[PDB]
Amino acid sequence: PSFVNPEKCDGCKALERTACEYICPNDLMTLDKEKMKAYNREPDMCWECYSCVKMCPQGAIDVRGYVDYSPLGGACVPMRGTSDIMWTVKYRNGKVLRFKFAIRTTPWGSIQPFEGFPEPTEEALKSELLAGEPEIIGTSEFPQVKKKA
Amino acid sequence: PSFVNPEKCDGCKALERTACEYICPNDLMTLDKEKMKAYNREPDMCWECYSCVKMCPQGAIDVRGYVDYSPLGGACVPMRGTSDIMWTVKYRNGKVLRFKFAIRTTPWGSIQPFEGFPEPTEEALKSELLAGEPEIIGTSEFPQVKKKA
Amino acid sequence: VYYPKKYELYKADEVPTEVVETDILIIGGGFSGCGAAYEAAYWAKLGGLKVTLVEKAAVERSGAVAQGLSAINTYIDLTGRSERQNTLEDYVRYVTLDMMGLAREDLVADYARHVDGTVHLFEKWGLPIWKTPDGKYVREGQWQIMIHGESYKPIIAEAAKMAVGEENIYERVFIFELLKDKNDPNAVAGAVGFSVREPKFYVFKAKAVILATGGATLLFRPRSTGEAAGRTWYAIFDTGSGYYMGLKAGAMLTQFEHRFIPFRFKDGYGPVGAWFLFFKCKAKNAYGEEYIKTRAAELEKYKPYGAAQPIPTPLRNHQVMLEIMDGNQPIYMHTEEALAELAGGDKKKLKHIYEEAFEDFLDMTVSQALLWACQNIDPQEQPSEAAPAEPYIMGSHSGEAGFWVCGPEDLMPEEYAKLFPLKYNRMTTVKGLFAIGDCAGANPHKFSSGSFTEGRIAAKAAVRFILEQKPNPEIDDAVVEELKKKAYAPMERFMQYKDLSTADDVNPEYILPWQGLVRLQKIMDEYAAGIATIYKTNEKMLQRALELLAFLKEDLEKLAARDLHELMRAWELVHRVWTAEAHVRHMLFRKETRWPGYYYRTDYPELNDEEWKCFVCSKYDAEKDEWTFEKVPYVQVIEWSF
Amino acid sequence: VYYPKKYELYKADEVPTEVVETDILIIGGGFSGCGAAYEAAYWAKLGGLKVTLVEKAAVERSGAVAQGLSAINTYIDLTGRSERQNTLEDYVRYVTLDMMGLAREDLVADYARHVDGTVHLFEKWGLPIWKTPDGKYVREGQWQIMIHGESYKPIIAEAAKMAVGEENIYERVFIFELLKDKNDPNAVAGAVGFSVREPKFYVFKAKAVILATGGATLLFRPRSTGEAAGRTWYAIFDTGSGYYMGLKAGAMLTQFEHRFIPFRFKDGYGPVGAWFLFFKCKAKNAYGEEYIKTRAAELEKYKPYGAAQPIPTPLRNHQVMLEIMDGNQPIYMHTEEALAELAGGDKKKLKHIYEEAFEDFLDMTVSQALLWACQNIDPQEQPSEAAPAEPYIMGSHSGEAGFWVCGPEDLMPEEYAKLFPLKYNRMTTVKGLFAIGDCAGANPHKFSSGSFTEGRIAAKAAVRFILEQKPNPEIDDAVVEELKKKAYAPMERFMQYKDLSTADDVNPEYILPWQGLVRLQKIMDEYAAGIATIYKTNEKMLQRALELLAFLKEDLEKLAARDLHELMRAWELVHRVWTAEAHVRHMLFRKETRWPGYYYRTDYPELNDEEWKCFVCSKYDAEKDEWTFEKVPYVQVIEWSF
């Protein structure tokens, strides 16, 4: 499960939103108004998806494998950029692996949903065609399927 | 597991010791110095042995069956005396059963450990006989057992 | 277990209501939901229709694709953009056979002819797809393609946001019940929910509602019950919300007995698809026997299914189960032999496939890489243990549980249209209510691309439905207030009975969400073919399950919650319990064992194509509190042969 | 899971050490312990010897008899005080056959010739024993008598207290390690512990030490993992403390592979002894089949064990397992048919036996009565489900795991004396160290009366040892200091690394007790023949268990504790982990399946009387950190034939 590092955490300085608390798909990350530091409110409901870790001020959040099956010592640390992500995998025995994978081939926020699509028409609304079809499918025409004789 | 009723509990302030905290075989019952009221500190380690319930101000402690398999509504309430114990079993459906069993045939604290026993002797120390034997066994002679030929 | 730092209690009457009027309401902003939002936005213009997307968490990372994915499991490739081209007929055949003969081919062929378009858009949108030096999409197996998908959801989330507009996306809002048309008992009119960030009750009024909540997990006790109870293979975020609200509304369910048991790396549940199909990894028992070989003969009794290619997934699971019963564990994924074999002595080649191996995990199930790190397991040196997880109920993956939905007019046979008052693609038996992704049953193997696609399909159908039928549903205000009271009842119960005990979590008058959940999991595990009985059950066990679920259902009326987070947990529990009951009733109804490997009816151990080659559909009538079952014979819609 | 209300942290150097000098130290104030205290006090007078009893809880209710007991399971009756008289030879035969041929008959015959005297004292002290109108003790089965034992422990506690004196009883002091003689690597010199009520380190210097800590529970994951993880059939209070400290000192263990799997009422684990033997209750599978009959054929292969009467306990279990494996659950205890048959239409008779039935539960496992109440189960109307629980390790009950101990001079054969440096009754292979109750192996079926009795035997032998050998062990102050530092290390580690995380229970540098226990339970459950595999295992699984236990053992060096309660929990875990390793190593060493029903070695499925009719004894050498095993052939000591 995830856990916040006190030393690096700053309860999200003056930004507009708490990254960790905003991203968690299971509503686990929250703030303790007193310490002004975040924490996982229900670790046994953590999927270890690393969303919080990736979206926070680097090093503020890490993951410690579920105790049920995880000996101490292991760690996977992500460094998510804009076109790729870097990973460091540290074994209990000291071994250290480093990887880097692409994550996106276009600029963030650059999506034009219906780029090049013709306008919808009441007539087209009655066919099986979805937006952009049959062109986007790449075929010479809308894919046909043989019905059972 | 066991739980304390705030209304009935008084933190054993009129006694030399705290009953529940004193009796629990798994060290679960403790006092919240603040409220001066007891509580089960680790319910998933409760054996539901009812020791705390029995040795406490009759209506202060009760047991709520483990949530894993217990539908709500059931209860077993004991009333422990000096020679007998009274039990009331209440079903989820409202049925109420009452039982009474003996628990001791002699006055409490009346045991004379070696009553009627002769003094121990160095000679006796080398035999197989325990205190009070062989007569406490019910036989005039120490029980014999045939060893295989 | 949950221990809130501080209370966050509100009484229903103290909570403000926010009413939201829209035309199309999408419940669930995961892959199917975003697919619906995207497509709906396109056609909605034809009538200036308002599209609204509600999500309990945040769309950027919500759902099953939170960590990203390492491949797109469904890409037909009708032109040759990948290393392998396929036909739609072969795909339909593949799915029907994997389902051991039972699949709504009209639904499968329908998403299959549209799916590639979706994938091409994903790439256009920035998703990096693995490519060969020749520029072809790299194939994993026959139907999948590898991707660098760590940001798979964020990208799809962006498309949806750009399509419908952030002002039409409500996040951190949990939907717990649907609203029906005061004017019509079998028509949807919206839904109700509540914020998990503040005291606010939501009432969504709509003309069409689309269920895209994902499937259901944590119904069964997992192989790890401590912190690792959170390491469910499938999305722990999906708790059968769609199943609950739809069935309560009277929408018919289908194949709800068809759960999915995933065979994955043990404990971490890392993916095996790439290892099996791409790296050609072998799975062997503790003695070094490749059981897909040693257990081949046992599949002979399942003709013709047992001879398909690939072999049906449940049957592959069955072979694993036989090994488990014989005590031949641990079962190993020999990654060390796979990597050596593939690299062929070339150290630089080894380094490359080694990076691909770790990406397969780091791109979608990091826990598995972390598990290897904690246990000092280097895949190039030693094998990894594998095992089947507990059951999950969903309709987008290898399981086909979900609502009985209508198909396209050009593919759906008369045999499958009888239960639908209105014939609109992906609409349930309830008018105006649609179901997509995990929520739509009888057409599995959709996965990421297919679920997004099914969402598009239902979205267009919803716009068409609105413009053609022109509905004007009216919500019952009396029902709304009742639901609002029920919504926060758990918090009011806590305040009303917490004084009975000095411990908040040990009370005789209520149960907290985690307590009811532990109980549900134990019941399902022990009586509904969970891991406890190695997925075996029978009439008596299932009947006992119903009796225990009945006790639990009654106790839900005594649920308590200490804060908004736990209030959501309380309703997620409610959703799971009803989902669980439906699963049990379905398993009890089908008197056969069609998917050994997923579950076994020891009292009806054989597959019965004479009397059970049919979809099992059911309906729950809330007013009468009665479950009705119906058998719909399977008919081959698409041309194909074994 | 544990969430302390507030911290209670101390550093070793800030904790005062209280030194206690005594002659005989008894660790654990349960039934065997009280038996030893009682008898030691009698003989001690001969030399003005000091006897000290140390208990981690309160003797009044501590241990397995906390709720009371419904019967005394061992009463031979050599004079006819009960409804059935028996001979000692018949009893020895009974025990050896129940153990499938393996039992230290010199030890069994020894406690058996003494046990009735203990029972008679119990009645004289106030224990109410059920009696017939003629005044005879009421027999449950052949060896047990029914008792009104709700206050069974308080009565025995009073007797022990009156004998040894309250000032010689230390309660709420947890012993975590033994001390050995500075100048003799195989002689005990005392023990160390700490208070769980205040900051105080204890150093007990003694000439003789008696291990009476009870057996070990919670080593395996239970069938309930939430709150009900606390509902272990055997005493949740006993965590293998004696096993740990004795094995660390070099005392040899025996039959540690012999766990006990109790078949009991499901979930609550209420007793079945009275129901089976007294009420004549029938156990049937989900289809009304009485498996003891339908599975009789399966027992014919075991000779002569399978034709014995009563059928050996593990074999009765084996019949149950076959039903479970075949998926014929639920297994029912037909209490409704048993009561109706015994009442014979007599309503007053029915009421009487109905009250007896409830007392059977209320006097020893209230949870089962509470379960019936919560689930609205009336035993006169409906049957109850039954199931085998997870494995427990103990030597006083139906299991014989424990230390290899010396027997009496008149019964112990030369074959069994070879490993003991000093021939004193119940002394371990470590001079001055005795083991009783659950701690003494190879002589099971002691139960309450037998355990108390074995304590008496060891007590007298301890006095004889001291007066004859005049031991005078010297403790090593250097070791005491190192142990004191280790005692509170968990608290210090917590203070030292708690700042790495904003959450106390989620830290990368330490594990809390409940976290390490969850891990232990999962390891044992999945690899050491736990419920997860229907009690099956093999060499490969067991070897993997050792690898995982190694990781955990290493992590024990990083245990953390937030208060005294949790510090005790930390050592209780430490104790269980080593107990578990010993169990795994023993099961790994014995290449046969002698107790099907308790555990199955799928790689050696048969019972082997040709090479394995021997006791398996092991020794752990802490200095070398090496385990050594040896086989001690069984020899029949007492005259009896099949």
Ligand SMILES: Cc1cc2nc3c(=O)[nH]c(=O)nc-3n(C[C@H](O)[C@H](O)[C@H](O)COP(=O)(O)OP(=O)(O)OC[C@H]3O[C@@H](n4cnc5c(N)ncnc54)[C@H](O)[C@@H]3O)c2cc1C
């Ligand atoms: C570990 C794992 C590995 C997988 N690997 C692959 C792979 O490599 N390739 C591939 O193509 N597919 C893969 N899939 C499958 C794929 O991710 C699904 O098929 C797909 O996400 C299903 O979409 P959904 O819309 O039905 O569910 P999801 O995407 O899960 O979305 C459901 C949404 O509904 C929300 N929600 C739930 N209840 C409520 C409520 N009551 N109110 C409001 N919102 C709610 C959730 O928070 C989520 O945002 C995998 C899934 C998992 C879990």
Ligand SMILES: Cc1cc2nc3c(=O)[nH]c(=O)nc-3n(C[C@H](O)[C@H](O)[C@H](O)COP(=O)(O)OP(=O)(O)OC[C@H]3O[C@@H](n4cnc5c(N)ncnc54)[C@H](O)[C@@H]3O)c2cc1C
């Ligand atoms: C549910 C149940 C039902 C049973 N029913 C029957 C029946 O009907 N009739 C019958 O005759 N027998 C029955 N028995 C069996 C019987 O109770 C035992 O055989 C007997 O109690 C074993 O005694 P013991 O001395 O070995 O262990 P216990 O009696 O358990 O004593 C162990 C003691 O050691 C203490 N201790 C443990 N670790 C430490 C430490 N590290 N430091 C200090 N103290 C420590 C414990 O707190 C306890 O006081 C039953 C047992 C259970 C659990």
Ligand SMILES: Nc1ncnc2c1ncn2[C@@H]1O[C@H](COP(=O)(O)OS(=O)(=O)O)[C@@H](O)[C@H]1O
């Ligand atoms: N042994 C196998 N034989 C054929 N197909 C397999 C095999 N294993 C997995 N698959 C296929 O590969 C995909 C599943 O990948 P996994 O890594 O196992 O996990 S998943 O989460 O992406 O579903 C599905 O398309 C499934 O049909």
Ligand SMILES: Nc1ncnc2c1ncn2[C@@H]1O[C@H](COP(=O)(O)OS(=O)(=O)O)[C@@H](O)[C@H]1O
């Ligand atoms: N079916 C049986 N046949 C013979 N003996 C049995 C049977 N069932 C239980 N016993 C015996 O009765 C005693 C066990 O009682 P239980 O009620 O099962 O629980 S116990 O906790 O007291 O051990 C032991 O003496 C055991 O040998």
Ligand code: SF4
């Ligand atoms: S975790 Fe990171 S994002 Fe959250 S509050 Fe702390 S610094 Fe900010």
Ligand code: SF4
């Ligand atoms: S790892 Fe995922 S599931 Fe766990 S707290 Fe972070 S974001 Fe939430």
Ligand code: SF4
């Ligand atoms: S429960 Fe009873 S014994 Fe315990 S503190 Fe409260 S009043 Fe006293």
Ligand code: SF4
């Ligand atoms: S019921 Fe027993 S174990 Fe639970 S708290 Fe009370 S005394 Fe302790």
